[PDB]
Amino acid sequence: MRWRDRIAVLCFPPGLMLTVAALILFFIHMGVFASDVHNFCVIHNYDHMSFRYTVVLIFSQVISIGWAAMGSLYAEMTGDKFLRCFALTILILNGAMFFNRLCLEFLAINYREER
Amino acid sequence: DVMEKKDAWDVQEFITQMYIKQLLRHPAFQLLLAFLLLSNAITIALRTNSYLGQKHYELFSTIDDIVLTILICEVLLGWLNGFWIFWKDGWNILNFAIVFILFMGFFIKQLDMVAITYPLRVLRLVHVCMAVEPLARIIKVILQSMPDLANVMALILFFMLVFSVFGVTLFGAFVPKHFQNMGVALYTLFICITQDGWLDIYTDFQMDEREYAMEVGGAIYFAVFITLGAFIGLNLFVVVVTTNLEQMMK
Amino acid sequence: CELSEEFQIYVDEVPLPFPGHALIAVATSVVLGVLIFIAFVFQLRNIH
Amino acid sequence: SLRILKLISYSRGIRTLIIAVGETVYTVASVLTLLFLLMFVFAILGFCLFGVTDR
Amino acid sequence: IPPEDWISGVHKDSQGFNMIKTLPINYRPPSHMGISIPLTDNFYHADPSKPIPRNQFHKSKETGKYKQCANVTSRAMCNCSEHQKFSHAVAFSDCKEKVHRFKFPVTQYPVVLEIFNERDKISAEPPYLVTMTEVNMRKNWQLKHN
Ligand SMILES: CC(C)CCC[C@@H](C)[C@H]1CC[C@H]2[C@@H]3CC=C4C[C@@H](O)CC[C@]4(C)[C@H]3CC[C@]12C
Ligand SMILES: *[C@@H]1O[C@H](CO)[C@@H](O)[C@H](O)[C@H]1NC(C)=O
Ligand SMILES: *[C@@H]1O[C@H](CO)[C@@H](O)[C@H](O)[C@H]1NC(C)=O
Ligand SMILES: *[C@@H]1O[C@H](CO)[C@@H](O)[C@H](O)[C@H]1NC(C)=O
């Protein structure tokens, strides 16, 4: 249809947008991961490293993972290989980045606080 | 019918059909959940012993987290089909309350202790085990029978009050400490209604005037009242049981 | 005169702080999620 | 006593009574499991109410 | 703990737990911002001949004062004695090596104090009120008292 009008309004076509949201979640979480690694390696400024927001961005991680999955499932029935490849690539990169941040946080454990 | 091309709502109903196809009809996922719950039940049975818990406390915490996260995942998946149907259900309210109390005591600080953490887990154990069929009929008829139990309980308690007036006329400050305090008196009368080992009480009011006194009167009144009430209660219990069970047999 | 004393205590085997528990819980949760979802995609794609 | 049980393995009337009462095995097993679950629930409750305090 | 196994330092409490631990060389107690970064400026097992452990980050390197084991070359050069091998006090801690050990949650550790009075040994009295301090700036301990 008028993608034009599709992108017009009232709302929007099926899912899609919900898939590209995982992309911009990937963008911001990659930026935060880069800042974490940068502050861990050279500058050594543990005062302003993300030791403080710990569980809330992990919850953001998991809702983004579920969102990318649900978008892939809700976009697979279009019958076109490109959309499926798009969604599956986003799922794979989000899962890899989640596991990477989990390994990073489990590694830097002696640096936050003690209970 | 022919259904040349599906629409959005057919797609949604089909997606929900695959969603209820797994974890609700597949025996494998329920079997895995039951296996995990039986394993943590075994670890519960491995408690009451610090000699085992010294090498097991960290593993106990980890398996607590695992069972909590799979419980909340199940609750979220149930909420996916709709919040209204999960809120308007006869039994899902209980699982929701169980996981809500457990997670509230877990993440937020709480005085709930093991006396909340473990009974809630075994309540979930029961709620999982009744879903597997060969005790579901018996639990169903137990919950069908309890509303008919309620009237028998109410009548029994009302009769025991209207006879406890006659009791408390000869109670308090004499043959005391079990006939006094007017609620300890009521519960001692209930103890005698349960009809076991009241010879301690029989020796308690013994030797009033060593032959008859009120040692005859109060004892015989209370004894015939006890035997009549005990027979009536036990009968009414078994007859309500069989009455509500005949509803099962139909 | 000032009566004072000092002593030393070493403790060990901390099980885990909070992020370790959080990480193992969410890791198992998402492992189950991706396993169930891989099964879902495999079935629904192989029907087509 | 197991040999005595093998003695009582005869008497076909007892066999017919056993047949007539043998379909209740599943029912008594289910009620036994319910008893065991309730016993476990109040076991952990009683331990946490009176055994944990250690007074 | 007997002195011979205090020297040996391999004691076990009949259950698999080491009752005595030799502290790492150039050890400092942890701080609030993390258990791998020292900010306590008090050195245990102080030895200048060896490189410094756990000492990244600027404020860690800007602290740590060698009091007894000074710029005299090393631990064998910084001579100590037996009374510096049992003094649980501060400023004698440069040659503190062997300490005790405990499980993770200690519970009801008895802090019992006794006083010598030239004739006998008595216990601390209710007139003798007492204050507590930790000399490494930590905040995860508490006392039960009546
Ligand atoms: C709200 C939804 C969309 C998730 C997005 C999370 C955003 C809002 C969060 C997650 C990562 C966060 C940042 C992570 C790191 C830094 C640097 C730190 O020294 C102070 C906090 C600060 C500056 C945070 C600000 C807020 C932030 C950008
Ligand atoms: C060497 O040790 C002495 C002893 O206190 C001290 O005064 C002096 O400053 C030290 N010199 C250096 C270079 O550390
Ligand atoms: C012992 O140590 C002191 C300072 O701590 C030093 O002056 C003295 O020379 C040392 N003695 C020996 C024999 O090393
Ligand atoms: C301290 O511990 C001792 C030994 O167990 C005990 O008798 C005492 O009651 C405890 N005191 C407090 C205040 O807990």
Side-chain angles (χ1 to χ4, degrees):
Chain A
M1 208 68 37
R2 254 80 261 286
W3 249 64
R4 342 281 224 225
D5 217 310
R6 234 155 122 101
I7 329 284
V9 248
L10 322 336
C11 50
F12 227 63
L16 210 275
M17 160 298 312
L18 71 83
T19 285
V20 308
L23 264 298
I24 187 71
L25 261 287
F26 149 74
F27 174 31
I28 190 192
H29 292 196
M30 191 55 198
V32 152
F33 191 95
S35 163
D36 195 0
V37 152
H38 196 353
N39 216 274
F40 201 87
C41 57
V42 287
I43 180 65
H44 284 356
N45 165 286
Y46 303 148
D47 195 15
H48 308 330
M49 182 185 288
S50 189
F51 288 133
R52 184 141 301 251
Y53 301 141
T54 281
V55 77
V56 86
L57 208 51
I58 281 305
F59 262 58
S60 177
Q61 213 64 341
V62 73
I63 167 62
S64 155
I65 285 283
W67 256 27
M70 172 46 38
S72 159
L73 177 69
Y74 191 78
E76 158 284 349
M77 321 65 68
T78 200
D80 169 271
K81 322 292 162 296
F82 157 74
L83 261 72
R84 269 177 296 216
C85 184
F86 201 49
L88 288 203
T89 40
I90 298 285
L91 260 179
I92 290 303
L93 59 90
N94 271 274
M97 171 275 329
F98 159 78
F99 185 85
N100 221 5
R101 202 212 205 182
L102 174 131
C103 208
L104 213 180
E105 184 156 318
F106 211 100
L107 194 41
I109 183 58
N110 295 2
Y111 282 64
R112 343 193 55 82
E113 187 44 0
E114 193 56 41
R115 174 231 61 61
Chain B
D1 207 340
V2 175
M3 273 224 68
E4 182 254 298
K5 208 54 163 35
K6 30 164 52 165
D7 79 306
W9 265 259
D10 184 29
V11 157
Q12 188 258 332
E13 275 133 15
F14 147 84
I15 286 176
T16 58
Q17 208 267 354
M18 334 309 286
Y19 142 82
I20 63 177
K21 197 196 156 195
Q22 320 248 329
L23 182 136
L24 286 91
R25 209 197 34 93
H26 282 347
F29 298 146
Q30 287 322 103
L31 184 62
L32 178 64
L33 283 192
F35 269 26
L36 203 142
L37 259 168
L38 281 149
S39 207
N40 65 56
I42 284 187
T43 68
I44 288 172
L46 279 187
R47 213 44 49 74
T48 312
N49 177 348
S50 208
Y51 206 113
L52 261 295
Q54 38 211 29
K55 334 282 172 293
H56 192 16
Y57 152 49
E58 71 305 347
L59 308 181
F60 171 62
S61 72
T62 58
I63 65 188
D64 282 353
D65 308 334
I66 299 328
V67 79
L68 279 193
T69 196
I70 65 161
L71 278 199
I72 65 187
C73 164
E74 162 93 0
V75 170
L76 171 65
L77 289 195
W79 281 351
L80 166 67
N81 202 16
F83 193 34
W84 279 111
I85 186 51
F86 222 79
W87 208 91
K88 298 286 201 218
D89 200 69
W91 283 262
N92 298 355
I93 296 182
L94 287 180
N95 314 67
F96 157 68
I98 284 160
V99 302
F100 155 73
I101 293 155
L102 253 176
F103 170 70
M104 186 50 147
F106 180 47
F107 217 103
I108 317 294
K109 59 167 144 162
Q110 207 43 248
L111 320 94
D112 64 302
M113 82 215 78
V114 281
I116 268 67
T117 67
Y118 269 8
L120 274 285
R121 293 164 86 90
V122 300
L123 280 154
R124 171 62 182 195
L125 276 171
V126 168
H127 290 47
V128 164
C129 85
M130 44 66 59
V132 163
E133 57 94 28
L135 56 146
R137 166 190 91 159
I138 304 192
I139 70 106
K140 193 58 186 209
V141 304
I142 280 168
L143 52 98
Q144 286 235 332
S145 317
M146 51 145 288
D148 210 61
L149 263 67
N151 54 51
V152 161
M153 300 303 325
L155 282 161
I156 283 278
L157 263 80
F158 280 138
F159 285 138
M160 292 316 79
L161 293 168
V162 308
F163 283 119
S164 294
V165 192
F166 290 92
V168 300
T169 39
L170 187 39
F171 283 0
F174 148 72
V175 59
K177 312 291 167 295
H178 261 291
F179 293 132
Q180 212 182 42
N181 276 116
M182 57 304 306
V184 189
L186 275 164
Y187 281 142
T188 318
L189 291 151
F190 179 53
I191 288 164
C192 294
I193 288 150
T194 52
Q195 270 284 74
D196 189 277
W198 52 263
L199 288 207
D200 176 58
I201 318 292
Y202 181 44
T203 54
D204 271 343
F205 54 74
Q206 214 82 251
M207 311 275 258
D208 188 28
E209 203 74 280
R210 74 280 191 191
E211 43 151 289
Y212 259 42
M214 314 299 110
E215 190 177 347
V216 278
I220 61 141
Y221 302 160
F222 156 86
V224 303
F225 149 78
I226 273 295
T227 193
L228 165 69
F231 295 155
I232 283 292
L234 184 134
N235 294 141
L236 270 174
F237 291 159
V238 311
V239 200
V240 167
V241 165
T242 189
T243 290
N244 291 258
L245 225 58
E246 195 40 76
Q247 319 309 94
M248 154 182 96
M249 276 339 279
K250 299 309 276 317
Chain C
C1 41
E2 214 51 81
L3 304 132
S4 284
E5 197 83 329
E6 309 225 36
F7 50 99
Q8 304 137 338
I9 290 152
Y10 200 67
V11 309
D12 53 77
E13 58 156 279
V14 152
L16 223 36
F18 71 95
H21 302 164
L23 286 189
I24 58 106
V26 302
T28 58
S29 80
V30 304
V31 153
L32 182 161
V34 299
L35 180 53
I36 297 308
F37 197 100
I38 280 307
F40 257 133
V41 163
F42 171 78
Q43 191 268 339
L44 286 174
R45 176 205 150 175
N46 276 259
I47 297 288
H48 277 50
Chain D
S1 160
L2 304 169
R3 283 131 84 98
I4 302 188
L5 283 160
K6 196 146 158 282
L7 213 178
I8 308 306
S9 271
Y10 285 87
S11 311
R12 279 132 45 163
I14 311 184
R15 212 182 324 277
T16 48
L17 193 140
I18 278 158
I19 286 299
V21 308
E23 79 283 330
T24 78
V25 173
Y26 305 136
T27 67
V28 301
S30 318
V31 191
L32 185 134
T33 51
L34 272 167
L35 212 167
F36 269 56
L37 306 190
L38 171 66
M39 152 86 78
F40 207 96
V41 172
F42 222 97
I44 208 58
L45 277 157
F47 167 58
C48 297
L49 275 184
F50 323 103
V52 152
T53 171
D54 284 306
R55 59 166 190 206
Chain E
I1 280 185
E4 69 276 9
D5 220 314
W6 193 256
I7 295 292
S8 188
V10 291
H11 197 104
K12 218 89 73 205
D13 53 349
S14 163
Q15 259 275 20
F17 212 99
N18 205 338
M19 213 57 237
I20 177 174
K21 175 51 68 169
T22 313
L23 213 53
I25 271 182
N26 283 237
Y27 183 80
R28 283 165 73 194
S31 76
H32 65 87
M33 35 86 75
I35 62 180
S36 180
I37 315 106
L39 284 72
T40 51
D41 68 74
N42 279 337
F43 259 111
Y44 302 80
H45 217 181
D47 201 0
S49 43
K50 324 302 221 303
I52 195 74
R54 308 263 282 280
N55 229 293
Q56 48 171 186
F57 181 115
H58 40 95
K59 314 302 301 323
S60 96
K61 276 301 289 322
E62 282 132 14
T63 51
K65 307 319 157 175
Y66 285 94
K67 304 172 211 93
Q68 161 178 56
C69 204
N71 51 350
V72 52
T73 308
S74 80
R75 266 283 276 121
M77 304 73 261
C78 69
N79 39 308
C80 294
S81 86
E82 190 267 344
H83 201 41
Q84 320 200 64
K85 293 309 145 71
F86 277 86
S87 58
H88 295 269
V90 84
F92 274 53
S93 57
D94 278 6
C95 41
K96 199 58 189 168
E97 321 108 323
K98 272 84 164 148
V99 309
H100 295 68
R101 250 200 144 187
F102 287 105
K103 263 276 309 178
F104 160 62
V106 315
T107 314
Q108 301 301 307
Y109 194 141
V111 191
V112 47
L113 311 165
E114 56 260 353
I115 301 176
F116 304 91
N117 208 329
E118 210 207 79
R119 268 292 317 126
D120 45 3
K121 169 166 61 54
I122 65 149
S123 59
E125 45 254 24
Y128 278 19
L129 296 183
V130 156
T131 43
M132 201 56 68
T133 322
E134 158 93 22
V135 289
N136 298 325
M137 308 330 90
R138 335 194 52 81
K139 47 108 201 170
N140 244 22
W141 49 272
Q142 79 222 9
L143 267 80
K144 270 158 275 319
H145 69 314
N146 59 299

